[PDB]
């Protein structure tokens, strides 16, 4: 089965092609993770996936999505990850982390607590920052503060510091969160970036924050560990062919700047869109990026059945298949997939205290 073939990228070898993508848990306190995350992540690692990427972890307090988001903006925050990294490795999975800044989508309630921008008088909220003072709209009406050049320098340095901390906490894979309408995606998109300085206007200028952040992170992130990013390559906003072309050009520049793999996603930059949700819907788009940028890719958003995952790999649409919600439902999804695909000794996807009894 293609799904169960190992994958090597730089010095890291994944035991199979199942990746658990970053999934926010909304359970941290002032950015500090706790035994929620420890058990959640260690349990997933034991389930058999080759790669486990920790949820969007804020590079700065104002870059959290919500008051429950994880952070890595101090050494104390980083040290909280050390035992979790060690548990993921003990289970034979590769520990990764997504480092993030939510931009104009920050200062929001948890999804089961309203999912909307926090009220002005709620003591939990904060001022958001963005390339331009324009609100997302809908349930996120807060107008962000337009960043100064010094803000841009500061946030870049926060990504560098976050990457350094991740490295020293023992992560073996990093993902820069340039997707989903958060700060990086919002610099790239003309919907959200109306700047007239070096960081807006032209393709080169809109790309600049992302490319400069990648280059700065590259200075501290080891060359022998995968350096990756998540990026929304289209919006489903009626501008798809032009946006895809620009996204592919940016992907080429990321590759030239040392990116090892791209997680291909949707922008979610604005609310007025028509995303065609369905099984494996991102497959053809991921394949086009893979082919036109000549870069390994993963994607998600409906690949969470064993046959869909296998088909995507065999068609060379993807190099890794990211499976999210199915792992919330069943942390041992990789074992389920091994059984479904008829892998020999499928139960040994799991550790011995489980595998022995399930054979």
Ligand X SMILES: Cc1cc2c(cc1C)N(C[C@H](O)[C@H](O)[C@H](O)COP(=O)(O)O)c1[nH]c(=O)[nH]c(=O)c1N2
Ligand Y SMILES: O=c1ccc2ccccc2o1
Instruction: Say which entry of ligand Y, ligand X, its own copies, none residue 21 contacts (CB below 5 to 8 A, set by partner kind).
Output: ligand X
- Residue 34 C-beta: closest distance to ligand Y, Å: 6
Residue 236 CA from chain centroid, whole number? 20
Tell me the CA end-to-end span of the chain in Å, nearest whole number: 18
Site pattern 86..125 for ligand Y (x: CB under 6 A): ----xx-------------x--------------------
Phi, psi dihedral angles at 288 (to 5 degrees): -65, -40
Binding to ligand Y by residue 43, rule CB under 6 A?
no
**Residue 98 known to bind ligand:** yes
Bridge partners of residue 96, in order along the sequence: 53, 173
Query: Per CB under 6 A, which of residues 182..241 are in contact with ligand Y?
Result: none
**Residue 191 known to bind ligand:** no
Phi, psi dihedral angles at 227 (to 5 degrees): -115, 110
Q: How far apart are CA 158 and CA 138, in angstroms?
A: 29
List 4, 187, 268, 336, residue binding ligand Y (CB under 6 A):
268
Query: Per CB under 6 A, which of residues 282..341 are in contact with ligand Y?
Result: 301-302, 325
User: Residue 203 or residue 354: which is nearer to ligand Y going by CB?
Assistant: 354
In which residue are the tokens 């999912």 written? 115
Alpha helices in 58-193 (DSSP H): 75-90, 149-169, 183-188
- Residue 357 C-beta: closest distance to ligand X, Å: 4
Let me know how long the chain is.
359
Q: C-alpha distances in angstroms, 205 versus 101, 134, 248, 250, 293?
A: 19, 18, 16, 12, 20
List 112, 276, 357, 359, residue binding ligand Y (CB under 6 A):
357
134-149: burial string, b at 16+ Cβ within 10 Å, e else: bebeeebebebeebee
Binding to ligand Y by residue 61, rule CB under 6 A?
no
User: Residue 184 or residue 200: which is nearer to ligand X going by CB?
Assistant: 184
Which residues lie near ligand X (CB under 6 A)?
21-24, 55-56, 98, 177, 179-180, 230, 300-302, 304, 323-326, 357
**Residue 24 known to bind ligand:** yes
**Residue 279 known to bind ligand:** no
Interaction site with ligand Y (CB under 6 A)? 24, 34-36, 46, 56, 65, 90-91, 105, 180, 268, 277, 301-302, 325, 351, 357
């Amino acid at each position: 089965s293609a799904l169960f073939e190992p994958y090597t990228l730089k010095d890291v070898t994944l035991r199979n092609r199942i990746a658990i993508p970053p999934m926010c848990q909304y359970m941290a306190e002032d950015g500090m993770i706790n035994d929620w995350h420890h058990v959640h992540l260690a349990g997933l690692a034991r389930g058999g996936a080759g790669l486990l990427v920790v949820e969007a972890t804020a590079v700065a307090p104002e870059g959290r999505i919500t008051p429950g988001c994880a952070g890595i903006w101090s050494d104390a925050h980083a040290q909280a990850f050390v035992p979790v990294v060690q548990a993921i490795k003990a289970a034979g999975s590769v520990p990764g982390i997504q480092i993030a800044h939510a931009g104009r989508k920050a200062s929001a309630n948890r999804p089961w607590e309203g999912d909307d921008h926090i009220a002005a008088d709620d003591t939990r909220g904060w001022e958001t920052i963005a390339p331009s003072a324009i609100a997302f709209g809908a349930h996120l009406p807060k107008v962000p503060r337009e960043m100064t050049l010094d803000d841009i320098a500061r946030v870049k340095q926060d990504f560098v510091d976050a990457a350094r901390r991740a490295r020293d906490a023992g992560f073996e894979w990093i993902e820069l969160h340039f997707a989903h309408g958060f700060l990086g995606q919002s610099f790239f998109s003309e919907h959200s970036n109306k700047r007239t300085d070096a960081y807006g206007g032209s393709f080169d200028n809109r790309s600049r924050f992302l490319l400069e952040t990648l280059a700065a992170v590259r200075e501290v992130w080891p060359e022998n560990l995968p350096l990756t990013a998540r990026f929304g390559v289209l919006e489903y906003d009626g501008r798809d062919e032009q946006t895809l072309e620009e996204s592919i050009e940016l992907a080429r520049r990321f590759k030239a700047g040392g990116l090892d793999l791209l997680s291909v996603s949707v922008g979610f930059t604005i609310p007025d869109t028509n995303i065609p949700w369905g099984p494996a819907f991102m497959g053809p788009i991921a394949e086009r990026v893979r082919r036109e940028a000549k870069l390994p890719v993963t994607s998600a958003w409906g690949f969470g059945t064993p046959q869909l995952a296998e088909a995507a790999l065999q068609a060379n649409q993807l190099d890794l298949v990211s499976v999210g919600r199915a792992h919330l439902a069943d942390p041992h999804w990789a074992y389920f997939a091994a059984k479904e695909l008829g892998v020999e000794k499928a139960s040994w996807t799991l550790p011995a205290p489980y595998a022995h009894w399930l054979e």
